[PDB]
Amino acid sequence: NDGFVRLRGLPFGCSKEEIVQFFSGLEIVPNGITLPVDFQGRSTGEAFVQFASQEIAEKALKKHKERIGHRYIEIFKSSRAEVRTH
Numbered sequence: 001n002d003g004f005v006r007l008r009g010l011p012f013g014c015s016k017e018e019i020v021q022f023f024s025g026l027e028i029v030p031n032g033i034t035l036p037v038d039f040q041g042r043s044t045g046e047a048f049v050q051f052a053s054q055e056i057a058e059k060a061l062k063k064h065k066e067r068i069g070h071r072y073i074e075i076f077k078s079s080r081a082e083v084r085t086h
């Protein structure tokens, strides 16, 4: 159970509080949200999220185009490999 997804479209400066609550009831591992510390990634609104299992990550994939504030959040399958080397 790798459990990784990739987000796109987050608001610039979107907080971890907003991302966790967007995924309310889908368990994220400790430090499971990886944010860009760079400007193009922040402008894209990229993040990676590591859920506690692939079964949980499969449920997260269904939230595609739900909102954080004004923005429609895009949700893609990902992997440990992609989080480490992106």
Ligand SMILES: [Cl-]
Pocket: 016
């Ligand atoms: Cl933080």
Ligand SMILES: [Cl-]
Pocket: 037, 038, 039, 042
């Ligand atoms: Cl920045």
Ligand SMILES: [Cl-]
Pocket: 065, 066, 067
């Ligand atoms: Cl929505």
Ligand code: NA
Pocket: 005, 006, 076, 077, 078, 079, 082
């Ligand atoms: Na991906």
